[PDB]
Symmetry: D2
Subunit: 247 residues, 4 copies
């Protein structure tokens, strides 16, 4: 069986280095690159694309809100029209670097607060979906299963890719546990790898509030010690005979 | 005979409306749209592209320095690597809006200080040329004839388009007269139209410092009262039997 | 009797001219100057301060959200800590220009979405109040009467200035009528002037949903045709024997 | 004898942590804090000011060019008017945080390319000097000795503070050796400390191109392994009986 391992990257801005792209790229099969709004200045995008290419990592767009200082982690009251234009702008900018390096745009996955706004706001979700569709109808959109975001993406006629989080706790409802909830985030790479295997091999994950829940992981998202977690997860999957490859 | 009339557009940023796109688009055959660095926020780009499409105007990229407050009119010590990445980023962003609207990217023409830096700096000129070539080898680059900029563009293997300025005075050397030089800028739309016709029909323009100089105008650049000048110029050309069409 | 007439100003950014400061300054007694976040680049701030000084207009800070493209008109999920720091930064920046021109900082009044967030969010309101207090305990804060914003400002120990809007319709509740509600905004300068006089002379204004409501106007806020409205309002007040002066 | 040890700080921007303020502050007597243009977002400024206060470090403004992505390290063709306004804006913004924390603004020292432009351009140097003077005539300006920058500062009537660089090689001319010149930068903290002592105790430093040159160090500037160098330098000075205190 196979699964895609994805991680955010190229979020550095100018002189401000961010993340551990060098350590993460050799472990993942796909990367979500920032497009200059919440991170990723032009030179850093070019650098990240070159790194991904060198490591045979598939590159997708990681569009976000126009809030650099806030790293796109803050909710912003953008109109659907503004979301559509901002997403198009970002996808296009990244695609130029991929074109220069002879690589295709693999997917699109919203970043931070935009992602969250999409998961609970139909108009925002629809705007993202239409922007992606208008750019390339064939582009897959990474979404959180069971959300209005997955719904609008499907209604738009886009191919959807289901994401799972081995580092985040799940609730019986099938949705992610609230951030600051005791035990909401799995820190031990060993358990995360354990959970990852389970999600792939069995399509299920333990639930924080009792029992377990079903989850179909087309791709597994990886976050500090991210390299360690990513390492642990990839190894557990490969030692298990699971192929880690871009979706 | 035919000639292209081009003007900058889509330079508005957010709530800050700029220029007279509505009045200029029905007069020109090509437009140079800002890409978010010295002007042109995403929503304004989308708006300008829609307007151009409605008026059958060809759209090209107008990349500039990353200096919004300065409107990209200030020289910046960008390394060639930075110029290359910034230009790619901008061309890509604009191309996404054209793709959504089913339009092709017609050309590329640097804006303000970047344009000027290119005209006198070989490394900058080369960086712009390579960025354009890396994105689409078939993209024509608008340049100032007789400059190192035209040279590097040709050395890069790109198709070059020669620009002339009916509103600017020329010197016997064949280059544009210094900005603050007495009589450097033609304000009377009548004379500008007069000069425009001459450049097209005869391939020559009066020189400020005596006599006249040769000029091949594949395209004529148009700037306040820009609409009046553009109007006067287009009419003089059409009443003369000259076809105004995108190059 | 006397009253202060205030209007926003200095919102231009770089090459992007905004508003009609030249036409408005000779009509108002106080101005709320942008501080570089939603508008007002350094050069434009300096320009606005010089203009105010030339016209003997009192200058206050008009801090907003860090959203230039959105003109600070979009709600942003800033933490109270972030609101506090952003407001301090802005007040300080403007105060430097006033110091250079030998003028005092007259007041503080939040801009756009920040203002609205303050009117309904106690933590945001408190953060603004504390920032102002930390900079100068003696600085008056302009607020909307009957809001949690007025409450937190008073709880913080700051002097509060009550603002009224002759151009906006009021509801019996005493609060402003919703923006897109039929008849929510008074366009006729004559009626606005009429309402303005009433608010000053009688401390009351007609209510959109029947009868009238009480309103104490320490200052009257003025907005396109803003100059006309401002003109009409100031004249109605002066021809009525009401002194227009900074609070 | 006494001397001031200064280092840049507070350059982090939003989520982008930069430098080693925590390690450097306990070693220096003065810090040059970024003001939001080339680094230092509002929250990070507040954080740096709090840290300095906790460590009894004197805080000065470190104004720079409006080039965040370039970290203010790139030459920009700002007019003297623009330099003046930008510097005022920045000094004012930082002063608000100092006021809130009950601390005075200790000095002003330009950052990166602005600093370099000032050292060779009289109009830029004058603009900086006048901005500082307009804000507070009593504010000392840190300058490079023997430059047009020191000259304009003195002509402006400002108190000037002479800076020396124990980590940079000097030429017989008395000016700093070119960056990429073999041996231009002292990496060994031991030698840097050695040089530092010499500059203080003897007012001289070895010259790269032979012999030595005179240098009066009112303050010593400290830069990766900056903490190590700063540590080595402070210890060498204290073990030598030299008092490290703000000028």
């Amino acid at each position: 069986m196979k699964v895609d391992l994805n991680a955010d990257a190229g979020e550095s801005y100018g002189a401000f280095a961010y993340g551990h792209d060098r350590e993460i790229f050799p472990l993942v099969s796909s990367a979500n690159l920032a497009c200059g709004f919440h991170g990723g200045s032009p030179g850093r995008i070019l650098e990240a694309v070159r790194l991904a290419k060198a490591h045979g990592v598939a590159v997708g767009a990681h569009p976000g809100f126009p809030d650099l200082v806030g790293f796109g982690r803050r909710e912003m009251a953008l109109s659907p029209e503004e979301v559509y234009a901002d997403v198009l702008y970002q996808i296009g900018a990244l695609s130029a670097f991929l074109k220069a390096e002879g690589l295709p745009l693999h997917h699109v996955k919203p970043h931070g607060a935009l992602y969250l706004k999409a998961c609970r706001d139909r108009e925002t979700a629809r705007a993202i979906a239409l922007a992606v569709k208008a750019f390339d109808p064939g582009l897959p959109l990474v979404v959180l299963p069971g959300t209005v975001y997955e719904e609008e993406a499907r209604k738009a006629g886009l191919r959807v890719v289901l994401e799972a989080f081995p580092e985040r706790a799940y609730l019986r409802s099938g949705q992610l546990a609230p951030r600051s909830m005791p035990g909401s985030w799995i820190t031990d790479p060993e358990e995360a790898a354990r959970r990852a295997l389970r999600m792939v091999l069995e399509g299920k994950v333990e639930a924080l509030d009792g029992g377990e829940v079903a989850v179909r992981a087309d791709t597994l998202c990886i976050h500090p010690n991210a390299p360690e977690v990513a390492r642990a997860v990839r190894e557990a999957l490969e030692q298990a005979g699971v192929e880690v490859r871009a979706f």
